[PDB]
Amino acid sequence: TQRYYVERPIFSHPVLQERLHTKDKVPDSIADKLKQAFTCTPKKIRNIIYMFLPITKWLPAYKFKEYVLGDLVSGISTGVLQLPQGLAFAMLAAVPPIFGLYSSFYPVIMYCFLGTSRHISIGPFAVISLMIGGVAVRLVPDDIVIPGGVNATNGTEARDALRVKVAMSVTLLSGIIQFCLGVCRFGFVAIYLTEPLVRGFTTAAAVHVFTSMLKYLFGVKTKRYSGIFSVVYSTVAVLQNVKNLNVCSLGVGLMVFGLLLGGKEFNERFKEKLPAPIPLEFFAVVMGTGISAGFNLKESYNVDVVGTLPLGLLPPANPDTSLFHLVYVDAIAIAIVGFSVTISMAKTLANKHGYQVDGNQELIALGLCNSIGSLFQTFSISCSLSRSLVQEGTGGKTQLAGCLASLMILLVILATGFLFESLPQAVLSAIVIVNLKGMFMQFSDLPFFWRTSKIELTIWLTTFVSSLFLGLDYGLITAVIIALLTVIYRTQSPSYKVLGKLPETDVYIDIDAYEEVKEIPGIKIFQINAPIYYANSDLYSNALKRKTGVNPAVIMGARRKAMRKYAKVKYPPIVIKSTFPEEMQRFMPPGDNVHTVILDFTQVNFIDSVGVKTLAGIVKEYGDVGIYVYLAGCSAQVVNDLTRNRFFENPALWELLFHSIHDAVLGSQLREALAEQEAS
Amino acid sequence: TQRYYVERPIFSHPVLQERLHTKDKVPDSIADKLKQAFTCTPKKIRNIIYMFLPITKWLPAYKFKEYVLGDLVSGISTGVLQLPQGLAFAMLAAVPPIFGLYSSFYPVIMYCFLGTSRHISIGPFAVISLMIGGVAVRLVPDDIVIPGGVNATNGTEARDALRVKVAMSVTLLSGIIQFCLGVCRFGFVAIYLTEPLVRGFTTAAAVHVFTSMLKYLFGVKTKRYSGIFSVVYSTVAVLQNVKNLNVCSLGVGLMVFGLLLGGKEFNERFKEKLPAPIPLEFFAVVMGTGISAGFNLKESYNVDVVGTLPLGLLPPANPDTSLFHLVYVDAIAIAIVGFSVTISMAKTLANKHGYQVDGNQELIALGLCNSIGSLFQTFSISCSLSRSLVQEGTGGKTQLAGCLASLMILLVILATGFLFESLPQAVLSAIVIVNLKGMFMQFSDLPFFWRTSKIELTIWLTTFVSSLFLGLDYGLITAVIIALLTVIYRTQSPSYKVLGKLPETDVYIDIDAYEEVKEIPGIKIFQINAPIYYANSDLYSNALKRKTGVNPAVIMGARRKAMRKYAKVKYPPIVIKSTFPEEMQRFMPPGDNVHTVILDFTQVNFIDSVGVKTLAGIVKEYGDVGIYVYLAGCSAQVVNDLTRNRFFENPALWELLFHSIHDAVLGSQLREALAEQEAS
């Protein structure tokens, strides 16, 4: 075996520096650093094509045997879920449901080629649909009359068309913003999305969706409220209007919701006995439309339905740029929220399955998809948590599952679009509610975060509160700001400890930690696990003057009191000898007689000018009362910062630095012994 | 002498822990921690009185011999400067100049008793006056007619009275806000005011004052613009209207400005030959009023003057609460700006003269002064940089200098208020401009900050730009946000280094730093001077995989390529043996054959859950390719955070920790030797 054995002289800063010679670096010119970027070698362009076109990468390496079955099952499962979710989200966007199915085909097909993640399900999203509906209602109210040859029997078709045009314009603007961010390499900001913030935001979004879905489930008309305090106003409005509910719609909604819960529980408890989960949502919608067609609930009980669905695709239409100045803020908010959600989902899925994704590529893909969808009459969409979870849980391995979902959506549109026109909205509302259980189950993190880290619990609660009461446009920004400020809070509240020397060794630990460390008499050691920046110097000084119990101010006051009671270019030395008479020292109150104070810098990352001034003031103040101060474990960054500042203007301060706490202690003891040598 | 000598066994985490026993702490109950707060001992109440009433402290200990002369000279010098500055600031507040002198008596007297700092000059301030004037104009335009018996010859007295009432109401609200903040111990936020931010804010405020003073100097009427892009609009407006200037006013202003510059330069170069500086501003105003009275410039050349000054004090008047809902934002902004400026000045003066101030006490004093001044017809004021500099430079030692200034201001008001009514505004504008040279000279910090620290230079430039173009209400907030974000920027860009062992010692330094350190073969050491929080884990992982040149992904790819080319409750062990045949190893590309990677945690302050997951993933990934990873120098905080998380669920991970880099290296070498013992 071997033992920790090392013998060396005391390494002060000048001694360490004189034994080392600075290495000569190789200057890399900017022109020379950019010249090789234009080699245009075939490998470089091939890599660029693969990065910009991920389809060319994962498609040639597609292993059919272990992927065809899983991709097929996952695609069927995600399509039979995207169709009702898309129809429900279309209603939430204040647009005809036919446009929701349109948004479920073009962006998915485009992302099957421009997408990097192979486990996320691109499609209609609840939050984006709610924001689009709110802005459409705000721009287009219910009191607009167009004399375009329409008679008095107005079916509000013009209002719906105007809302669709507004949605198309804002979608195009959001896509342009996303593409500009992607080409600007702005995707690096996704790292700021910590997991608790994302979970809290998703939970708050789930709460908003649940409280917005109440009106559809009950069937009672309620004004849509967008902005600050939207959730509370919406829920009190639906509570006040609950007296005029529809019995049939509520009953069928409760019945289908109970059936969905029973089927989901049965699938969960019979997972091993099935080769693939059965589509429960498809059975639910089939049952709902069959009952509605058989009993004619549209007029028999005045139960609202999804409405008519026109068939056939539409030719591309050029949008208009006359609405940018009205919804430019909302387009940016939609782009930010959608990009954040999709990048968070892609990152967590990549971590789960062991791969990587590129944020810039995702931004470019989202921008192109949104722009082309706007050209093809499709509103802005983003990633969906529940649908992606279903896709991954059913065996999703590549992006071909989304292509199958888009193909089957197109088939339904072209062939069986009329069959689903009689589906009541209550069934869709119940389907949305039951699929929301995954995000609602995330409330279990509160005890977990309470036990693990209270700071993360505070961040999660702040994010949830900000995204619940305040609008989602500013709630995410507020949550990000709070998360960033938590780092400042942590740096402003470090753990100050008094270190003691373990006997017969060189390990320094807290004096009040293990009962075996003995503090060296006459030496005080102070340690701070935080930087010395401007908003921390005062707290550090107070902690040093309090925890160590050595305050120069009170020492000077005691000296003055004892003196008054007993009476009845060159630089000066840093440490001034205590000119206190021995006779006066007889009336001096007893103390620890500390002669050396050691400050730990092993856990200091950087120091600013304010910190430099504070440290210089502390050193001078302690040297005035004749107490030596040495710096131990200073990193090269701290030394460089001190050199660039005016802290090292006096060459006599170079001897105050050391390399380790034990080295500083040995140097101080040697200095004391040498001083005692000439004493007598 | 002595040498660094220590012999000990390799201290792994279990070995260190088994040799130490946790100390039993003393639980301090909250009820027991608050019970002693109500002792009501005479010393405690005396200290409370001294803290709340600083006048009772420094007045009994007033040394007359060395303070009477200096305080007298400083008080005279600051009064003869506050009178013209107060008159000028009153005009900038869109209020009659008599109110400016009123603001120069009551708050100063009150602060002479409720103030802690003994070197700051409380009085009218340019920024606060400008904000008050802007809000008064915004609330009270020039198109308001009051049929209160006034004939067609309206002198706009009602408009001035309404503006005064608005100023009084906003001053009272700001004082209430300041008092509430003071009683809430909110003064601790003053630590966020770093020196570069304060200097940039003061410089931008000086620029705003200089560009606003142009209209008074020229005498041409110009609409006052408040809000965003106010400075640019004001300067282009005065440039367009410069064609209608007044020759006499501009000429006399230039003459008095030149005289002031000459006198200031003469005093600077004859400082040693004078016992006390002569009052130059008093001579300037006397000359200006004498010339104006002799030549009657009011009507001879249409030169505007300060106006009539009513005599006698006014009885207290109860304000109204009907304007809070209109200026509540502006009152908060005024309070924040004034408190920030005064606390910064008090802190820097305390540091210069070697004492301390309390932010909460300053907040309480400002709130009480503003509220009582509102009761006594006085607008909100704050500390002035130039006047405080003059007070300190003339020998200011206590607060009695301000009392003398208030007394002489009251004497002028009661006796010689009519004499100064003929003083032209050009003289006051020139006096303001010449006293602004101190803040304008602060532009020399740009090369200093460029050489010392580029980050502080960026902060200063950002603060200046934000407070120049954008409004001062939001410019300070933006500067604070940028300053806070600079810490995050520093933590997101650390300095990754590869460490090497100095021969015959235990000092590890950068391999490319001193040319003498030799890297130990087969061992990679990585060091990061930054935390491992959520917004830094990915960069840390990339740096570890790039700088060390040991990426498990490329290793696995090379192994697979070599294999394909040559072919033609218990837990698993963390490190998996490389099942690579020796025959296949013959086709394996050569490499450094690293068997151990050491991660430095001596400079790590904290790690979050995201960092814990990232570290666990890195450890597992490196153990998959059969590479050992050890953690060295982990602080108690990091160990506690890992324990609270799920990182230590497997007991086999406790042996991976160490106490020092050398200890980890010795342990790895011993493990390799032991493994080689059973090899053959």
UniProtKB/Swiss-Prot annotation, chains A, B:
It is a multi-pass membrane protein. It catalyses: 2 hydrogencarbonate(in) + chloride(out) = 2 hydrogencarbonate(out) + chloride(in). Residues 94-96, 140-156, 219-229, 242-246, 296-320, 377-384, 421-424, 470-471 are extracellular. Residues 513-668 form the STAS domain. A motif (Involved in motor function) lies at residues 146-156. Homodimer. Interacts (via STAS domain) with CALM; this interaction is calcium-dependent and the STAS domain interacts with only one lobe of CALM which is an elongated conformation. Interacts with MYH1. This is Prestin. The gene is SLC26A5.
